[PDB]
Design a protein around this ligand. Structure first.
Ligand SMILES: C#CCN1C(=O)[C@@H](C)N(CCC(C)C)c2nc(Nc3cc(F)c(O)c(F)c3)ncc21
Length: 322
């Protein structure tokens, strides 16, 4: 059911005018089309925006829109980039939203930045390996993103390569996308208790998700950091220990619990020899020390990863090396 007439002009709630182009990536990512500001030109394949459109009763698009309106306004993002002295911040820019009726059904739409490739495609094209340099540079920037969203009351719960996209015009800038299943863990500064939330039915991506999520509790900050830990190992080695049993969540949980209790055994399992990168172990030990409601020391985590860069004769020069 086509939601748009190709080339139509749509007006968001702030009265800004946009033009709709063709769907992205051969329709493999659902109802997301290229978009640009209204003009006499039609929308090309190098369009700088996309429009996401879903039925108005779609829960995830509403959640995602509230995240962007609350936490990702220009002033908030630019103020943070300035005050933290960052090169950039990988939270996608939200441009506008509205309601669109068609054929007697009601839809919601959101205009966002258009990106280049996801990291999963690049990872697979590299025979499922990223270099130590790449993984550390990706993870430093993801720590910047997580600190930002955490400080604005949200956790992501689903960090992975397919949710990490490159700036269309700059392959050294990575962005974390998909807030449809994001969770507001700290509304108005009050942390959610350590329990299930009936409103939330999402457990994340089984191979990467947190022990908290496996235990049926709502995601919190430590969980996001834990997810990133599992990603780092997957990216460095091509594997995780529990990957042959992902249809059995009890098995996945059991194995994560055991490897959290004995991080040296995780390093032995995942890396050759006594050839584990020490920063990965230290990262995981530091995350292990976090209580459910505890604020992470994000700078201490970044410093741990920076020691990895010094160990390989490099520095944080922002080069992803993809
Ligand atoms: C053309 C092109 C490249 N290209 C893709 O091949 C896939 C990987 N995707 C979909 C990812 C979704 C499924 C997360 C993209 N997405 C965007 N922009 C975007 C920004 C956001 F902030 C969103 O929330 C959002 F849905 C989409 N821009 C380019 C892409």
């Amino acid at each position: 059911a086509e939601q748009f007439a190709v080339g139509e002009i749509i007006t968001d709630m702030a009265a800004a005018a946009w033009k709709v182009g063709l769907p992205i990536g051969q329709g493999g990512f659902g109802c997301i089309y290229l978009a640009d500001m209204n003009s006499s030109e039609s929308v090309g394949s190098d369009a700088p925006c996309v429009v996401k459109v879903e039925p108005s009763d779609n829960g995830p698009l509403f959640t995602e829109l509230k995240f962007y309106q609350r936490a990702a306004k220009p002033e908030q993002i630019q103020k943070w980039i300035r005050t933290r002295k960052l090169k950039y911040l990988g939270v996608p820019k939200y441009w506008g939203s509205g309601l669109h009726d068609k054929n007697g059904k009601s839809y919601r739409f959101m205009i966002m930045d258009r990106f280049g490739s996801d990291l999963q495609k690049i990872y697979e094209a590299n025979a499922k390996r990223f270099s130590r340099k790449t993984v550390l540079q990706l993870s430093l920037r993801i720590l910047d993103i997580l600190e930002y969203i955490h400080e604005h009351e949200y956790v992501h719960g689903d960090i992975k390569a397919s949710n990490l996209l490159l700036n269309y015009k700059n392959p050294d800038q990575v962005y974390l996308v998909d807030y449809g299943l994001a969770y507001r863990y700290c509304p108005e500064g009050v942390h959610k208790a350590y329990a299930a939330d009936p409103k939330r039915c999402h457990d994340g991506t089984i191979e990467f998700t947190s022990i908290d999520a496996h235990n049926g509790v709502a995601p919190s900050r430590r969980g996001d950091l834990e997810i990133l830990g599992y990603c780092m190992i997957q990216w460095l080695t091509g594997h995780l220990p529990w990957e042959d049993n992902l249809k059995d969540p009890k098995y996945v949980r059991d194995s994560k619990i055991r490897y959290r209790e004995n991080i040296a055994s995780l390093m032995d399992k995942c890396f050759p020899a006594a050839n584990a990168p020490g920063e990965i172990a230290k990262y995981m030990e530091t995350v292990k020390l976090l209580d459910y409601t505890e604020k992470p020391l994000y700078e201490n985590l970044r410093d741990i990863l920076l020691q990895g860069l010094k160990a390989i004769g490099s520095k944080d020069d922002g080069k992803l090396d993809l």
